[PDB]
Symmetry: D2
């Protein structure tokens, strides 16, 4: 279960580099030089790294400091063969963003948020990133009067439309991936789920330039089924990036290593990504727990990839097993894939087998055989 | 706080008529004749009633029994002046629907589900309903292998497209309202939130014929902010119906009377409906608790309307209060409503006040004054 | 992974016998004769069965009907070698219990609830049960004024005290196991968690006669860690029975087969039961999903036991692995087991190594190595 | 609704003094001098302040710095008439506590945690505090192997027993109040609810010296009913302190001002505290949102007290209303307060009205009238 380049595993600088600050505790680890993280991740078999502007370039850097940080980072990438497939903006840490970036009530803040973003899109392109994530962690409210959501969605559409105009005007080959989250750090976050973000994208001027960046933990913070949401994103053709991690139910954002948390959901997610032929990077947005020293940081990172690969093997074995294929037919998964009424509406209307002569009791007596199927899936997951 | 016809309060037959069966208990009340419910609701000041096919016409009725049930119902409506603004299909109670209606794995069931629906659309039109709700409570799964969600969404789009074709071919003035719910009775339900349903609608052949029917409790079962979801539905122009009730957090679907549950969310919801000028019926999908006899049934129903009207008065007083209007300006809600960059992208790019000369620390020092605003809102809610 | 008698797997009649009624759907399966369930469970390798009074004897039976039902059941038990280790009362299904049994506001109902219980304790003893469960599913409220909880806890203590007096007066070798649940079917249930039930027991007249009957799903409906709660029950010496099943987070009570739901929690639970030497039956309180016919019922039951046995093997392999034993020392689990201050208070107070000479920064630098440990646990669980 | 000294409202230094650091954001406010917070709180009508050791004395202070900080604080208290009813230890912020204080796996850390605590108990007594809170926010785990909970509970009992020995040996008039929380900052926290803490206390050597310090938000993070848990604490005689704030459901610990969050639960809590005659301080453990400047800090604090007083008036009006008193009898709350069987077990056993002649159907027909009662409560809450 040793990772390879084709596996395309990627990590945020802010993941392994998380110093361990939490709402109730100080840092437990020293800051990492992004150069060291690139080296260490490459040695573990990662394919690439991602960044927030402020992870790579200290906030408020001069042009000359900016240049030197980027230079050093590029040398590490060249030294290791690591790629930079995705970048994003930090529009959440600095106090100025306490009520939002793109949907701050203060118009001057909204404009500043756009200018910060646009500066880093230029950098992202310079580094070869083809995806630009946006997680509006500060867009939202703690109280009902603080944020008129219709006006906020107008400001959010305005901002993304301006960004689409900018990338189009520059001829850039980059697309955006909007990351939902239901809450934390705001009491409620705008675009709280995969669904709300998919729906919002359809109202943008250039919808083709935007997709979702769903995160395992975030949908689970709403008690939603993350494989189901990914399936809807896939169905819509909007899965432009994914964040992989673990989460134990409805609570604060834990960002556990991938595999931890809801293990059966991790299994079904890998099954779906691999079955659908998803071609994007398998990106980890996780935090080694603050209990850990650097050895545990690298162990946690390695474990992300290991778990993905173990689940990939098990899901593959599940789908290739003739007994599972038989069970899937027994449960009528083949029938679900066939059109209800390719014969068309009139034919349906005139088909007495769909109504007057439909034997409801005979149909109702038919078992779905879902338990046997799911125990086959469990046996495969556990290698039993 | 006495309801009037213009208030347009409506109730499902299945609401006050709920006999009190729950997962662990038998009925506590006798079945109600829909005629009696129409009479009683009218006496309380309701404007109309809604129905599932199977609430009005016992499942498996002959044509002559069908005719007589509808006749009796129409006499009660004519006797009282009650309207029937909305109808829907029961695609969840009968065993044949145990794996779904429109997304059942069995194709014969999917066709039967469409034919059942289409029959009741004809009835709904005969009774004057302009909205046709669809709550796919059985669409989903308990286990991961049981339901391929991409195939299920294909079958779901197929079904709604056929229904759109049918209403178009008949020249009917009816529109559909899809009701999300995250779970219960399936382990996970497809289209689990307002967002997922909005997104799904945009993929239908005739999107203009479909909106959402969000329910207070259902979004709350995912710990989501129901006023926020309604705001997004409004923003999209897709709020075609609403279900009002109460829910105490993330747990089974309680369907408490409106006002109960999250009271502050009820306040903010009423504020939003009234401020936006929502013109649809204020429909209650609630269940008088099984502890109650018929006197308590009618008390619970009355309480739905009373709470709506008390919250309407308080929200109106909040928005009309010059001190609140001052607080809203202090918190920059006026600024949120103004375009970020009506000057356009280039102007933004060339505006040094948005970047080089933006004083982040001065901006960050500015308080949002949201606490004073929210205590004004609380004072208004409580009449303090 | 074939079950044996020493495995002591037991099932409620109401588990495999669940006809599939849910809040939104009719039964999907016919009623099972308890005789058939005993036969079928024995063929799968179960050790015994448990019952509610009303599962074995239809409510309202005459003495002669009572005798004949018990006779038939006893013949099946004798035919199969199945045991009856536990019984309980149905104080939740009949309408009379809509506000509770022991804590109903109506005193006449409370007395009736006690008499119903006492009748079935006599039967339980006749059948050899040594544990008598009590799940007060109707004890609680939907609204705040309906139930004064201090008075309710007085009535609850009164009832259990009377039951303790009764078993003592009869010389019966039976102990009680109180089953917490946070909600459903009441909006909030009294004694909502393992903790609240442990605390309540300590106030009873004869605390030694009462323990907890925790259920996996029930603690998870509060987002609690079920292995942690079991550990506290074990620590207190109060784990008198356990209910095993699966649950996918904070939602309605799903009662999935054991292993389903939170798989990693199932692993840690089995590890704890086996490591602690728990000697009670491994009882399943689960419901085969209503999608299933009888073949799927028996498959689901078999799967409960299979998953328990697969997890037992993996946990055993984890604890026996010298590499895990090394990791556990690396993480200082050995140190957690040693007294903080067996030297006593004064010695602690006078120990400069505990304060003036304690190097906080050196201590803080020490990693806990928990990630490596947990990846060893994951590898063992998955057989990787 | 102006607060008075008899109202006994108290605040933690760390509440109004919270600088606004969250998991995703830097401080938005400068640090407050505890002297200024004492002055400002007194001007708002608070009765007193509480502290963690590290809120009053910077961690690592010399004896002379310690003395000067305490001196300044005592002058402000004397200047204002403010009291210090409660103190506590910070055993969560410093890295050394990343795996716990009293239940850290490292024994040297456990001893250090005890010595830190004991030092501040001496200070607490010097300042007149009669209650000493303990919130073990770091006691727990993110993974299953990291923490053997039985061993941890042994270490936790050891620590509290040593503290009880210490206060007894010194002749101090101080009692402990253990604060449960279900999670955050650990994945699961030991003693996660009021119930688990009540149960744990009963196993200590000197149980009379320990009670609970329940926090509104914390029980709500488990979706529990906070008034119910308080009622059980009251019933047990163990409510030694309370933390008041707001929380919007199952999510991260929000610490909103009291009244915010679940308003109806705030109503029922105040009703219960006032009806039971609770005599402890009404302590607020809340955080003004980081959106706010200092004006909003003081507004938020004022709002805590205002909401408590508005709810007190409404609850009082509810209980004094003859119509409510009539409704409470109609719902049989009087009967719930009367013994089930003061006649004793034998009498119960011989009472044919409790069994053979109990008319279940007549009893079951009786409505509980809970909806009318709850609408009276709602009308009172809203002043309608
Ligand atoms: Mn996250
Ligand atoms: Mn992410
Ligand atoms: Mn509902
Ligand atoms: Mn509804
Ligand atoms: Mn259950
Ligand atoms: Mn159970
Ligand atoms: Mn808190
Ligand atoms: Mn607290």
């Amino acid at each position: 279960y040793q990772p390879t380049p084709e596996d395309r595993f990627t990590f945020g600088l802010w993941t392994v580099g998380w110093q361990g600050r939490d709402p109730f505790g100080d840092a437990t680890r020293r800051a990492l030089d992004p150069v060291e993280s690139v080296r260490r991740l490459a040695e573990l078999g990662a394919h690439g790294v991602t960044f927030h502007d402020d992870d790579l370039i200290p906030f408020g850097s001069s042009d000359s400091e900016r240049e030197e940080h980027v230079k050093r980072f590029r040398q590490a990438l060249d030294d290791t063969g690591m790629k930079v497939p995705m970048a994003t903006t930090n529009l959440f840490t600095h106090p100025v963003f306490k009520d939002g970036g793109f949907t701050a009530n203060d118009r001057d803040v909204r404009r500043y948020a756009l200018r910060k973003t646009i500066r880093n899109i230029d950098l992202a392109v310079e580094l070869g990133a083809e995806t630009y994530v946006a997680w509006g962690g500060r867009e939202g409210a703690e109280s009902g009067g603080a944020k008129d959501v219709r006006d906020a969605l107008d400001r959010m559409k305005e901002a993304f439309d301006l960004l689409g105009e900018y990338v189009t005007s520059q001829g850039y080959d980059i697309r955006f991936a909007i990351e939902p989250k239901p809450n934390e750090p705001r009491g409620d976050i705008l675009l709280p789920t995969v669904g709300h973000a998919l729906a919002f994208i359809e109202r943008l001027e250039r919808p083709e330039l935007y997709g979702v960046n769903p995160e395992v933990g975030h949908e689970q913070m709403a008690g939603l089924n993350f494989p189901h949401g990914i399936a809807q994103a896939l169905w819509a053709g909007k899965l432009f990036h994914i964040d992989l991690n673990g989460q134990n139910g409805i609570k604060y954002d834990q960002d556990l290593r991938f595999g931890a948390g809801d293990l059966r959901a991790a299994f079904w997610l890998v099954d779906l990504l691999e079955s659908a032929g998803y071609s994007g990077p398998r990106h980890f947005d996780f935090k080694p727990p603050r209990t850990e020293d650097f050895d545990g940081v690298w162990a946690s990172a390695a474990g992300c990839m290991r778990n993905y690969l173990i689940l990939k093997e098990r899901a593959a074995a599940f789908r290739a097993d003739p007994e599972v294929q038989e069970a899937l037919r027994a449960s009528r998964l083949d029938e679900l894939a066939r059109p209800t009424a390719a014969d068309g509406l009139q034919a349906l209307l005139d088909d007495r087998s769909a109504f007057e002569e439909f034997d409801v009791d005979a149909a109702a007596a038919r078992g779905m055989a879902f338990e046997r199927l799911d125990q086959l899936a469990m046996d495969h997951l556990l290698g039993a």
